[PDB]
CSV table of N, CA and C in Angstrom, one decimal:
chain,number,residue,atom,x,y,z
A,1,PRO,N,-54.6,-21.7,-69.6
A,1,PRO,CA,-53.5,-22.1,-68.7
A,1,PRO,C,-53.5,-21.4,-67.4
A,2,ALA,N,-53.2,-22.1,-66.3
A,2,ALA,CA,-53.1,-21.4,-65.0
A,2,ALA,C,-51.9,-20.4,-64.9
A,3,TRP,N,-50.8,-20.8,-65.6
A,3,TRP,CA,-49.7,-19.8,-65.6
A,3,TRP,C,-50.0,-18.5,-66.2
A,4,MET,N,-50.8,-18.6,-67.3
A,4,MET,CA,-51.2,-17.4,-68.0
A,4,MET,C,-52.1,-16.5,-67.1
A,5,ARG,N,-53.1,-17.0,-66.4
A,5,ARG,CA,-53.9,-16.2,-65.5
A,5,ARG,C,-53.1,-15.7,-64.3
A,6,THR,N,-52.3,-16.5,-63.7
A,6,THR,CA,-51.5,-16.0,-62.6
A,6,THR,C,-50.5,-15.0,-63.0
A,7,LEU,N,-49.9,-15.1,-64.2
A,7,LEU,CA,-49.0,-14.0,-64.6
A,7,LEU,C,-49.8,-12.8,-65.0
A,8,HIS,N,-51.0,-12.9,-65.5
A,8,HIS,CA,-51.9,-11.7,-65.7
A,8,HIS,C,-52.1,-11.0,-64.4
A,9,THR,N,-52.5,-11.7,-63.4
A,9,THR,CA,-52.8,-11.1,-62.1
A,9,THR,C,-51.5,-10.5,-61.5
A,10,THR,N,-50.4,-11.2,-61.6
A,10,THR,CA,-49.1,-10.6,-61.0
A,10,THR,C,-48.7,-9.4,-61.8
A,11,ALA,N,-48.8,-9.3,-63.1
A,11,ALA,CA,-48.5,-8.2,-63.9
A,11,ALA,C,-49.4,-7.0,-63.6
A,12,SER,N,-50.7,-7.3,-63.4
A,12,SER,CA,-51.6,-6.2,-63.1
A,12,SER,C,-51.3,-5.6,-61.7
A,13,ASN,N,-51.0,-6.5,-60.8
A,13,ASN,CA,-50.6,-6.0,-59.4
A,13,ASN,C,-49.4,-5.2,-59.5
A,14,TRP,N,-48.4,-5.6,-60.3
A,14,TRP,CA,-47.2,-4.8,-60.5
A,14,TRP,C,-47.4,-3.5,-61.1
A,15,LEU,N,-48.3,-3.4,-62.1
A,15,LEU,CA,-48.7,-2.1,-62.7
A,15,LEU,C,-49.3,-1.2,-61.6
A,16,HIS,N,-50.2,-1.8,-60.8
A,16,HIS,CA,-50.8,-1.0,-59.7
A,16,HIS,C,-49.7,-0.5,-58.7
A,17,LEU,N,-48.7,-1.3,-58.4
A,17,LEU,CA,-47.7,-0.9,-57.4
A,17,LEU,C,-46.7,0.1,-58.1
A,18,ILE,N,-46.3,-0.2,-59.3
A,18,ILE,CA,-45.3,0.7,-59.9
A,18,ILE,C,-45.8,2.1,-60.2
A,19,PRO,N,-45.1,3.1,-59.8
A,19,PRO,CA,-45.6,4.5,-60.1
A,19,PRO,C,-45.6,4.7,-61.6
A,20,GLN,N,-46.4,5.7,-62.1
A,20,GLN,CA,-46.7,5.9,-63.5
A,20,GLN,C,-46.2,7.2,-64.0
A,21,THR,N,-45.5,8.0,-63.2
A,21,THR,CA,-45.1,9.4,-63.6
A,21,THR,C,-43.6,9.6,-63.1
A,22,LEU,N,-42.8,10.2,-64.0
A,22,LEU,CA,-41.6,10.8,-63.7
A,22,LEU,C,-41.1,11.8,-64.7
A,23,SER,N,-41.3,13.1,-64.3
A,23,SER,CA,-40.9,14.2,-65.2
A,23,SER,C,-39.5,14.5,-65.2
A,24,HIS,N,-38.9,14.8,-66.3
A,24,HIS,CA,-37.5,15.2,-66.4
A,24,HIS,C,-37.2,16.6,-65.8
B,1,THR,N,-5.3,17.3,-39.0
B,1,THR,CA,-4.8,17.0,-37.7
B,1,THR,C,-4.8,15.5,-37.3
B,2,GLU,N,-4.7,14.7,-38.3
B,2,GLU,CA,-4.6,13.2,-38.2
B,2,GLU,C,-5.9,12.7,-37.5
B,3,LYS,N,-5.8,11.6,-36.9
B,3,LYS,CA,-6.9,11.0,-36.2
B,3,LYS,C,-6.9,11.5,-34.7
B,4,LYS,N,-7.7,10.9,-33.9
B,4,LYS,CA,-7.8,11.3,-32.5
B,4,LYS,C,-7.6,10.1,-31.5
B,5,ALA,N,-7.0,9.0,-32.0
B,5,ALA,CA,-6.7,7.8,-31.3
B,5,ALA,C,-8.0,7.1,-30.9
B,6,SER,N,-9.1,7.6,-31.2
B,6,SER,CA,-10.4,7.0,-30.9
B,6,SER,C,-11.4,7.2,-32.0
B,7,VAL,N,-10.9,7.1,-33.3
B,7,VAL,CA,-11.7,7.3,-34.5
B,7,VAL,C,-11.5,6.1,-35.4
B,8,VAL,N,-12.6,5.6,-35.8
B,8,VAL,CA,-12.6,4.5,-36.8
B,8,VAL,C,-13.2,4.9,-38.1
B,9,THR,N,-12.6,4.5,-39.2
B,9,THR,CA,-13.1,4.7,-40.5
B,9,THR,C,-13.9,3.5,-41.0
B,10,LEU,N,-15.2,3.7,-41.0
B,10,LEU,CA,-16.2,2.7,-41.4
B,10,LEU,C,-16.5,2.8,-42.9
B,11,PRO,N,-16.4,1.7,-43.6
B,11,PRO,CA,-16.8,1.7,-45.0
B,11,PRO,C,-18.3,1.8,-45.1
B,12,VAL,N,-18.8,2.3,-46.2
B,12,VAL,CA,-20.3,2.3,-46.5
B,12,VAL,C,-20.4,1.5,-47.8
B,13,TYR,N,-21.0,0.3,-47.7
B,13,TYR,CA,-21.3,-0.5,-48.8
B,13,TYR,C,-22.7,-0.3,-49.3
B,14,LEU,N,-22.9,-0.6,-50.6
B,14,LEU,CA,-24.3,-0.4,-51.2
B,14,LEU,C,-25.3,-1.4,-50.6
B,15,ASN,N,-24.9,-2.6,-50.4
B,15,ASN,CA,-25.8,-3.7,-49.9
B,15,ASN,C,-25.0,-4.6,-49.1
B,16,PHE,N,-25.7,-5.7,-48.6
B,16,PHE,CA,-25.1,-6.7,-47.7
B,16,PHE,C,-23.9,-7.4,-48.3
B,17,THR,N,-23.9,-7.6,-49.6
B,17,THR,CA,-22.8,-8.3,-50.2
B,17,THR,C,-21.4,-7.6,-50.0
B,18,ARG,N,-21.5,-6.3,-49.7
B,18,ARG,CA,-20.2,-5.5,-49.5
B,18,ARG,C,-19.3,-5.6,-50.7
B,19,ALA,N,-19.8,-5.7,-51.9
B,19,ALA,CA,-19.0,-5.8,-53.1
B,19,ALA,C,-18.8,-4.4,-53.7
B,20,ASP,N,-19.5,-3.4,-53.3
B,20,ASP,CA,-19.4,-2.1,-53.8
B,20,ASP,C,-19.2,-1.0,-52.7
B,21,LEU,N,-18.1,-0.4,-52.7
B,21,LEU,CA,-17.8,0.7,-51.7
B,21,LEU,C,-18.4,2.0,-52.2
B,22,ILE,N,-19.2,2.7,-51.3
B,22,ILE,CA,-19.8,3.9,-51.7
B,22,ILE,C,-18.9,5.0,-51.2
B,23,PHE,N,-18.6,5.1,-50.0
B,23,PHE,CA,-17.7,6.1,-49.4
B,23,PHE,C,-17.3,5.6,-48.0
B,24,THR,N,-16.6,6.5,-47.3
B,24,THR,CA,-16.1,6.2,-45.9
B,24,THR,C,-16.6,7.3,-45.0
B,25,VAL,N,-16.8,6.8,-43.7
B,25,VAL,CA,-17.3,7.7,-42.6
B,25,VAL,C,-16.3,7.6,-41.4
B,26,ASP,N,-16.0,8.7,-40.7
B,26,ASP,CA,-15.2,8.6,-39.5
B,26,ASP,C,-16.1,8.7,-38.3
B,27,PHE,N,-15.9,7.8,-37.3
B,27,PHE,CA,-16.8,7.8,-36.1
B,27,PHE,C,-15.9,7.7,-34.9
B,28,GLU,N,-16.2,8.5,-33.9
B,28,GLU,CA,-15.5,8.5,-32.6
B,28,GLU,C,-15.9,7.2,-31.8
B,29,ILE,N,-15.1,6.6,-31.0
B,29,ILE,CA,-15.4,5.4,-30.3
B,29,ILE,C,-15.6,5.7,-28.8
B,30,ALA,N,-16.7,5.2,-28.2
B,30,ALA,CA,-17.0,5.5,-26.8
B,30,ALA,C,-16.3,4.5,-25.8
B,31,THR,N,-16.5,4.7,-24.5
B,31,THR,CA,-15.9,3.7,-23.6
B,31,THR,C,-14.5,3.4,-23.9
B,32,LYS,N,-14.1,2.2,-23.9
B,32,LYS,CA,-12.7,1.8,-24.3
B,32,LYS,C,-12.7,1.0,-25.6
B,33,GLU,N,-13.7,1.3,-26.5
B,33,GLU,CA,-13.8,0.6,-27.8
B,33,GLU,C,-12.4,0.5,-28.5
B,34,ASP,N,-12.1,-0.7,-28.9
B,34,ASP,CA,-10.8,-0.9,-29.6
B,34,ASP,C,-11.0,-0.8,-31.1
B,35,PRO,N,-10.4,0.2,-31.7
B,35,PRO,CA,-10.5,0.4,-33.2
B,35,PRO,C,-10.2,-1.0,-33.8
B,36,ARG,N,-9.2,-1.7,-33.1
B,36,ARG,CA,-8.8,-3.0,-33.6
B,36,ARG,C,-10.0,-4.0,-33.6
B,37,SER,N,-10.8,-4.0,-32.5
B,37,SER,CA,-11.9,-4.9,-32.4
B,37,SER,C,-13.0,-4.5,-33.5
B,38,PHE,N,-13.2,-3.2,-33.7
B,38,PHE,CA,-14.2,-2.8,-34.8
B,38,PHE,C,-13.7,-3.3,-36.1
B,39,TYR,N,-12.4,-3.2,-36.4
B,39,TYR,CA,-11.9,-3.7,-37.7
B,39,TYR,C,-12.0,-5.3,-37.8
B,40,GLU,N,-11.8,-6.0,-36.7
B,40,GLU,CA,-11.9,-7.4,-36.7
B,40,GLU,C,-13.3,-8.0,-36.8
B,41,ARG,N,-14.3,-7.2,-36.2
B,41,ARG,CA,-15.7,-7.7,-36.2
B,41,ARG,C,-16.4,-7.3,-37.5
B,42,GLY,N,-15.8,-6.7,-38.4
B,42,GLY,CA,-16.4,-6.3,-39.7
B,42,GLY,C,-17.5,-5.3,-39.5
B,43,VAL,N,-17.3,-4.3,-38.7
B,43,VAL,CA,-18.3,-3.2,-38.5
B,43,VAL,C,-18.3,-2.4,-39.8
B,44,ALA,N,-19.5,-2.2,-40.3
B,44,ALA,CA,-19.7,-1.5,-41.6
B,44,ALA,C,-21.0,-0.7,-41.6
B,45,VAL,N,-21.2,-0.1,-42.7
B,45,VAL,CA,-22.5,0.7,-43.0
B,45,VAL,C,-23.0,0.2,-44.4
B,46,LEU,N,-24.3,0.0,-44.5
B,46,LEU,CA,-25.0,-0.4,-45.7
B,46,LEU,C,-25.9,0.7,-46.1
B,47,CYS,N,-26.0,0.9,-47.4
B,47,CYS,CA,-27.0,1.8,-48.0
B,47,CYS,C,-28.4,1.2,-47.9
B,48,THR,N,-28.6,-0.1,-48.0
B,48,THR,CA,-29.8,-0.7,-47.8
B,48,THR,C,-29.7,-1.9,-46.8
C,1,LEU,N,-41.1,-10.9,-76.2
C,1,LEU,CA,-42.2,-11.2,-75.2
C,1,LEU,C,-42.1,-12.6,-74.7
C,2,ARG,N,-41.8,-13.5,-75.6
C,2,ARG,CA,-41.7,-14.9,-75.1
C,2,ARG,C,-40.6,-15.0,-74.1
C,3,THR,N,-39.4,-14.4,-74.3
C,3,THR,CA,-38.3,-14.5,-73.3
C,3,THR,C,-38.7,-13.8,-72.0
C,4,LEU,N,-39.4,-12.6,-72.1
C,4,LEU,CA,-39.8,-11.9,-70.9
C,4,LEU,C,-40.8,-12.7,-70.1
C,5,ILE,N,-41.8,-13.3,-70.8
C,5,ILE,CA,-42.8,-14.1,-70.1
C,5,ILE,C,-42.1,-15.3,-69.4
C,6,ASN,N,-41.1,-16.0,-70.1
C,6,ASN,CA,-40.4,-17.1,-69.5
C,6,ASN,C,-39.7,-16.6,-68.3
C,7,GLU,N,-39.0,-15.5,-68.3
C,7,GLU,CA,-38.3,-15.0,-67.1
C,7,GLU,C,-39.3,-14.7,-66.0
C,8,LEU,N,-40.4,-14.1,-66.3
C,8,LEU,CA,-41.4,-13.8,-65.3
C,8,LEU,C,-42.0,-15.1,-64.6
C,9,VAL,N,-42.3,-16.1,-65.5
C,9,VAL,CA,-42.8,-17.3,-64.9
C,9,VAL,C,-41.8,-18.0,-64.0
C,10,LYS,N,-40.6,-18.1,-64.4
C,10,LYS,CA,-39.5,-18.6,-63.6
C,10,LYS,C,-39.2,-17.7,-62.4
C,11,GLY,N,-39.7,-16.5,-62.4
C,11,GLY,CA,-39.4,-15.6,-61.3
C,11,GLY,C,-38.1,-14.9,-61.3
C,12,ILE,N,-37.4,-15.0,-62.5
C,12,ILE,CA,-36.1,-14.4,-62.6
C,12,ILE,C,-36.2,-12.9,-63.1
C,13,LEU,N,-35.4,-12.0,-62.5
C,13,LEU,CA,-35.4,-10.6,-62.9
C,13,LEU,C,-35.0,-10.5,-64.3
C,14,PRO,N,-35.8,-9.9,-65.2
C,14,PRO,CA,-35.4,-9.8,-66.6
C,14,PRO,C,-34.1,-9.0,-66.7
C,15,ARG,N,-33.3,-9.4,-67.7
C,15,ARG,CA,-32.0,-8.7,-67.9
C,15,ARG,C,-32.2,-7.3,-68.4
C,16,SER,N,-33.2,-7.1,-69.3
C,16,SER,CA,-33.5,-5.7,-69.7
C,16,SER,C,-33.9,-4.8,-68.6
C,17,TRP,N,-34.6,-5.3,-67.6
C,17,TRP,CA,-35.1,-4.5,-66.5
C,17,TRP,C,-33.9,-4.1,-65.6
C,18,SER,N,-32.9,-5.0,-65.4
C,18,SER,CA,-31.8,-4.8,-64.6
C,18,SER,C,-30.9,-3.7,-65.2
C,19,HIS,N,-31.0,-2.5,-64.8
C,19,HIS,CA,-30.2,-1.4,-65.3
C,19,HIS,C,-29.3,-0.8,-64.2
C,20,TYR,N,-29.8,-0.9,-62.9
C,20,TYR,CA,-29.0,-0.4,-61.8
C,20,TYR,C,-28.4,-1.6,-61.0
C,21,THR,N,-27.2,-1.4,-60.4
C,21,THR,CA,-26.6,-2.5,-59.8
C,21,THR,C,-27.4,-3.0,-58.6
C,22,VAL,N,-27.5,-4.3,-58.4
C,22,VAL,CA,-28.2,-4.9,-57.3
C,22,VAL,C,-27.5,-6.1,-56.7
C,23,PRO,N,-27.8,-6.4,-55.5
C,23,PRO,CA,-27.1,-7.6,-54.9
C,23,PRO,C,-27.5,-8.9,-55.7
C,24,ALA,N,-26.5,-9.8,-55.7
C,24,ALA,CA,-26.7,-11.0,-56.5
C,24,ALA,C,-27.8,-11.9,-55.9
C,25,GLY,N,-28.5,-12.6,-56.8
C,25,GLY,CA,-29.6,-13.5,-56.4
C,25,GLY,C,-30.8,-12.7,-56.0
C,26,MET,N,-31.1,-11.6,-56.6
C,26,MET,CA,-32.3,-10.8,-56.2
C,26,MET,C,-33.5,-11.1,-57.2
C,27,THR,N,-34.6,-11.6,-56.6
C,27,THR,CA,-35.7,-12.0,-57.4
C,27,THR,C,-36.5,-10.8,-57.9
C,28,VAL,N,-37.5,-11.1,-58.8
C,28,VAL,CA,-38.2,-10.0,-59.4
C,28,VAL,C,-39.3,-9.4,-58.5
C,29,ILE,N,-39.8,-10.3,-57.6
C,29,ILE,CA,-41.0,-9.8,-56.8
C,29,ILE,C,-40.5,-8.7,-55.8
C,30,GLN,N,-39.3,-8.8,-55.3
C,30,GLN,CA,-38.7,-7.8,-54.5
C,30,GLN,C,-38.1,-6.7,-55.3
C,31,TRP,N,-37.6,-7.0,-56.5
C,31,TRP,CA,-37.1,-6.0,-57.4
C,31,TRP,C,-38.1,-5.0,-57.7
C,32,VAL,N,-39.4,-5.4,-57.9
C,32,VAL,CA,-40.5,-4.5,-58.2
C,32,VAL,C,-40.7,-3.5,-57.1
C,33,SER,N,-40.7,-4.0,-55.9
C,33,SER,CA,-40.9,-3.1,-54.7
C,33,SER,C,-39.7,-2.1,-54.6
C,34,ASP,N,-38.5,-2.6,-54.8
C,34,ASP,CA,-37.3,-1.7,-54.7
C,34,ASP,C,-37.4,-0.7,-55.8
C,35,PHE,N,-37.8,-1.0,-57.0
C,35,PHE,CA,-37.9,-0.1,-58.1
C,35,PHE,C,-39.0,0.9,-57.9
C,36,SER,N,-40.1,0.4,-57.3
C,36,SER,CA,-41.2,1.3,-56.9
C,36,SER,C,-40.7,2.4,-55.9
C,37,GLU,N,-40.0,2.0,-54.9
C,37,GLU,CA,-39.5,2.9,-53.9
C,37,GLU,C,-38.5,3.9,-54.6
C,38,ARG,N,-37.6,3.4,-55.5
C,38,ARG,CA,-36.7,4.3,-56.1
C,38,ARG,C,-37.5,5.3,-57.0
C,39,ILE,N,-38.5,4.9,-57.7
C,39,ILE,CA,-39.3,5.8,-58.5
C,39,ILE,C,-40.0,6.8,-57.7
C,40,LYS,N,-40.5,6.4,-56.5
C,40,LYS,CA,-41.2,7.4,-55.6
C,40,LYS,C,-40.2,8.4,-55.2
C,41,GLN,N,-39.0,8.0,-54.8
C,41,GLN,CA,-37.9,9.0,-54.4
C,41,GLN,C,-37.6,9.9,-55.6
C,42,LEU,N,-37.5,9.4,-56.8
C,42,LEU,CA,-37.2,10.2,-58.0
C,42,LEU,C,-38.3,11.2,-58.2
C,43,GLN,N,-39.5,10.8,-58.0
C,43,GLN,CA,-40.6,11.8,-58.2
C,43,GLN,C,-40.6,12.9,-57.1
C,44,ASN,N,-40.3,12.5,-55.9
C,44,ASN,CA,-40.1,13.6,-54.9
C,44,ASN,C,-39.0,14.5,-55.2
C,45,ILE,N,-37.9,14.0,-55.7
C,45,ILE,CA,-36.7,14.8,-56.1
C,45,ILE,C,-37.1,15.8,-57.3
C,46,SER,N,-37.8,15.2,-58.3
C,46,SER,CA,-38.2,16.0,-59.4
C,46,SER,C,-39.2,17.1,-59.1
C,47,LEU,N,-40.1,16.7,-58.2
C,47,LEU,CA,-41.1,17.7,-57.8
C,47,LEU,C,-40.5,18.8,-57.0
C,48,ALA,N,-39.5,18.5,-56.1
C,48,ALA,CA,-38.8,19.5,-55.4
C,48,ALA,C,-38.0,20.4,-56.3
C,49,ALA,N,-37.4,19.8,-57.3
C,49,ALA,CA,-36.6,20.6,-58.3
C,49,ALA,C,-37.5,21.5,-59.1
C,50,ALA,N,-38.6,21.0,-59.6
C,50,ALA,CA,-39.5,21.8,-60.5
C,50,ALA,C,-40.2,22.9,-59.7
């Protein structure tokens, strides 16, 4: 499905943009 | 010492919706700025 | 996961994701950028504190 691939790409891009560390 | 007859209290809202007040700031007015005109024109401060 | 995928496909900000108050009618594509900026500031604050 096209929605599946486009959501995969969007979520991968979001993971790249979203920072991955925050120490208490 | 009260106000200075040239001081406006501007609200600081979180965003453009102005549904959440953060705090208030006091600003002096230059020239002949009417505190009344600032109140009527909806002059405010947004966090974003 | 089905609910979250549905929300993402329709472009609606997930309810679980919305934990801090936001202006009404805010889509997820800009929410991601806003949250990224907030996390960057939080990391700067935590690094300064530590």
